[PDB]
Nucleic acid binder design. Structure first.
Ligand SMILES: [Mg+2]
Ligand SMILES: [Mg+2]
Ligand SMILES: [Mg+2]
Ligand SMILES: [Mg+2]
Ligand SMILES: [Mg+2]
Ligand SMILES: [Mg+2]
Ligand SMILES: [Mg+2]
Ligand SMILES: [Mg+2]
Ligand SMILES: [Mg+2]
Ligand SMILES: [Mg+2]
Ligand SMILES: [Mg+2]
Ligand SMILES: [Mg+2]
Ligand SMILES: [Mg+2]
Ligand SMILES: [Mg+2]
Ligand SMILES: [Mg+2]
Ligand SMILES: [Mg+2]
Ligand SMILES: [Mg+2]
Ligand SMILES: [Mg+2]
Ligand SMILES: [Mg+2]
Ligand SMILES: [Mg+2]
Lengths: 95, 288, 250
RNA sequence: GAUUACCCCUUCUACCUUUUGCAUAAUGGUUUAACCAGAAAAAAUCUAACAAAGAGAACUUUAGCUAGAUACCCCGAAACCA
């Protein structure tokens, strides 16, 4: 992470985080499961199903991924047809 | 009013000499001096941490980093190029009309929504305009003429049941910038630009009467509209026999950015006068 | 005839206005020439020493630019060389003799470059600060509304004696509507004094209001301030800079 | 600690650093003076402004925004390059 850039003096973003993850507006980060394209003929139907699925990251991670991302990716987004738009709000959460 | 004034009568003159910041408004700043904060200064003992050189953020200590194990996938893919539509609930609309920010009297478009601060559009962020969602569907009483960028069935249904007229329009990014902030545009001293046609993927959207797109054949409007009245079971009001019919009828030219203005004119705000060119080539260029 | 001043802006339904004596500056003895109705929102605002403090400090610090530079270990004159070799000498090991430990060396941290302290308080905070200052002035009896402001003579002794006979306290600030429209005698007489002070209404501010024990306003000045300040309760959030064209606002 | 009384009695392993553990016979310093080492505001908390909006332009908004305040050292190689 670059905390102050050379030319603009701003705070840079790590792009390798932007390619594998997704930030919902609740703050949950959403990631693929490692090795899902890898050696399928070995694995059971069960394991294949477990691998195709998307999953959520623990607090320690979401926190870390947040530090590597600027304000622009924490933004509220309305896309036409957005699949995940139905998932971006949190409901019935009594902490 | 504030009985504090009566207390101020008996107290000494407020001056620079007595001024107290709010309690706990300033938090005291701590310095590494003395017995407590000195001597290792909260930096711990030796290691890399007390020299201050410990590694960068993602670093896991050399096992493959968490963020670098996971395969990549299109997620944020093309995020720069997906159009975005700022939502507008019928709640919000009914609300703006009710408190009388937007007036239903004159025809209601994007500009007048911006002026009412009901909706904030940022063309720069790949935002293509307002869309219509049905949140206030039952509550909605107003007789309105709306032009949005994208609309939903239930929204159109509601506005019909109340006897208003909806129309879908497309603006390109530049036109949208000009449409949302007209005054900072006129102070540029540029002519008034041509409006773009929708790109190829959107075109099938704006030719449908079901959508009530602005590029659609008006001849289907009396048809499909009536269809909408069957599905949600309301009787369709007669627009022709209405008193406000001359306002509802008002459309824009598909090439026009503004109501009653024309592509290629130039607004001089100092002399409060509008300038139009007589040049043949120029007039052909703008009229097309 | 007694000059009576009615408020030109709507008062809140639940709140009766405030009143102040209108004094004339021409007679020693003419204490109450008239009666002024003052707007309860500008002058009667719930007093907050808090916002007075915040803006009082802001005024002091937003202007501030410190030029204090100290040469760091890199910028000092010379000595880019090792004074003696690492091992074998018997003394402590050193790099450049310009290290911060050394006698002529660079300063380790110290003040760096010209520094600017600049922060912009949100508008409505500055506005309500101004209101509170006026309110405080009024509710402590140290505000005096004047009309005219024509002086009988240009002699400063007149102004000092006029302070004494009315018991105005030690220092005094005077506020006039415009800079061009200031009457002659006043300009001269005040421009000859330290403790008295003279300012256009465009230049009212909190720090100066607190710096003088007694504030004095012209009547058209009250008509001015009351309007400008009251305008911010009812405003929208700005779209572009207010200097540009708006429907109602110039 | 005390004593009429300086001692005489009685009670106590210099100080830092470093370590599992230092009176250590581990490191450092004759002594005095003057110099000689914690900097950042993403997220957060705290105090206020105005609030379905807020910011003195561009932004962010499912109670939010805007402002203030809270934060991250000093001395040392052998080297390498023109
Ligand atoms: Mg300590
Ligand atoms: Mg140490
Ligand atoms: Mg260690
Ligand atoms: Mg937006
Ligand atoms: Mg050098
Ligand atoms: Mg060298
Ligand atoms: Mg060196
Ligand atoms: Mg020097
Ligand atoms: Mg021992
Ligand atoms: Mg030591
Ligand atoms: Mg040992
Ligand atoms: Mg030993
Ligand atoms: Mg030894
Ligand atoms: Mg050793
Ligand atoms: Mg020794
Ligand atoms: Mg500090
Ligand atoms: Mg912050
Ligand atoms: Mg809050
Ligand atoms: Mg090399
Ligand atoms: Mg090397």
């Amino acid at each position: 992470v670059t905390y102050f850039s050379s030319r603009k003096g701003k705070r840079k973003t790590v792009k390798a985080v932007i390619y594998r993850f997704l930030r919902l507006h609740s703050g949950l980060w959403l990631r693929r499961k490692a090795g899902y394209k890898k050696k399928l003929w070995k694995k059971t139907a069960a394991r294949k199903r477990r691998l195709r699925e998307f999953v959520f990251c623990n607090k320690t991670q979401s926190k870390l991924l947040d530090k590597m991302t600027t304000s622009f990716w924490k933004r509220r987004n309305w896309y036409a047809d957005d699949p995940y738009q139905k998932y971006q709000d949190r409901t019935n959460l009594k902490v | 009013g504030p009985r504090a004034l009566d207390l101020l009568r008996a107290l000494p003159r407020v001056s620079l000499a007595n001024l107290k910041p709010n309690p706990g408004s300033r938090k005291p700043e701590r310095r590494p001096r003395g017995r407590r904060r000195g001597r290792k200064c909260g930096r711990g003992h030796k290691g890399e941490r007390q020299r201050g050189t410990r590694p960068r953020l993602g670093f896991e200590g050399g096992q493959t980093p968490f963020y670098l194990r996971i395969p990549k996938y299109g997620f944020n893919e093309g995020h720069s190029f997906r159009h975005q539509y700022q939502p507008l609930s019928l709640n919000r609309l009914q609300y703006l009309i009710d408190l009388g920010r937007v007036d239903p009297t004159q025809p209601i478009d994007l500009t007048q929504l911006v002026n009412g601060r009901g909706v904030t559009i940022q063309p720069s962020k790949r935002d293509y305009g307002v869309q219509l969602v049905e949140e206030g569907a039952d509550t909605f009483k107003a007789k309105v003429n709306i032009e949005v960028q994208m609309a939903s069935e239930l929204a159109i249904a509601a506005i019909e049941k109340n006897g208003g007229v909806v129309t879908t329009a497309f603006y390109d990014p530049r036109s949208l910038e000009i449409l949302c902030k007209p005054v900072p545009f006129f102070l540029r001293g540029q002519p008034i630009p041509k409006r773009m046609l929708p790109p190829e993927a959107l075109v099938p959207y704006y030719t449908d009467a079901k959508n009530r797109g602005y590029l659609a054949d008006p001849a289907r409007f009396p048809e499909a509209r009536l269809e909408l009245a069957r599905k949600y079971g309301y009787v369709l009001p007669d627009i022709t026999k209405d008193e406000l019919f001359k306002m509802l009828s008002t459309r824009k030219d598909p090439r026009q950015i503004f109501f009653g203005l024309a592509p290629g004119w130039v607004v001089n705000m100092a002399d409060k006068k509008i300038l139009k060119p007589t040049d043949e080539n120029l007039l052909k260029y703008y009229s097309s | 005839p007694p000059v009576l001043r009615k408020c030109e802006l709507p008062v809140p339904a639940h709140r009766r206005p405030v009143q102040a004596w209108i004094e004339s500056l021409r007679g020693y003895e003419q204490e109450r020439v008239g009666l002024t109705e003052l707007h309860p929102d500008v002058f009667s605002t719930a007093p907050r020493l808090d916002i007075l403090h915040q803006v009082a400090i802001w005024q002091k610090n937003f202007k501030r630019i410190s030029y204090a530079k100290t040469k760091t270990r890199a910028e000092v004159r010379g000595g880019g060389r090792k004074p003696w070799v690492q091992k074998g000498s018997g003394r402590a090991r050193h790099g450049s003799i310009r290290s911060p430990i050394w006698r002529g060396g660079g300063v380790a941290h110290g003040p760096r470059g010209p520094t600017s302290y600049y922060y912009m308080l949100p508008m409505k905070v500055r506005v309500q600060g101004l209101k509170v200052a006026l309110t405080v002035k009024l509710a402590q009896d140290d505000l005096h509304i004047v009309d005219s402001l024509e002086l009988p003579t240009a002699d400063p002794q007149y102004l000092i004696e006029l302070a004494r006979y009315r018991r105005w306290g030690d220092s005094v600030l005077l506020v006039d509507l415009e800079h061009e429209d200031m009457p002659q005698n006043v300009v001269a007489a005040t421009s000859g004094l330290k403790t008295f002070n003279l300012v256009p209404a465009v230049g009212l501010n909190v720090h100066s209001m607190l710096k003088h024990q007694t504030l004095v306003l012209t009547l058209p000045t009250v008509a001015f301030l009351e309007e400008k300040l009251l305008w911010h309760n009812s405003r929208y959030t700005p779209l572009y800079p207010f200097r540009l064209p708006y429907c109602d606002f110039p």
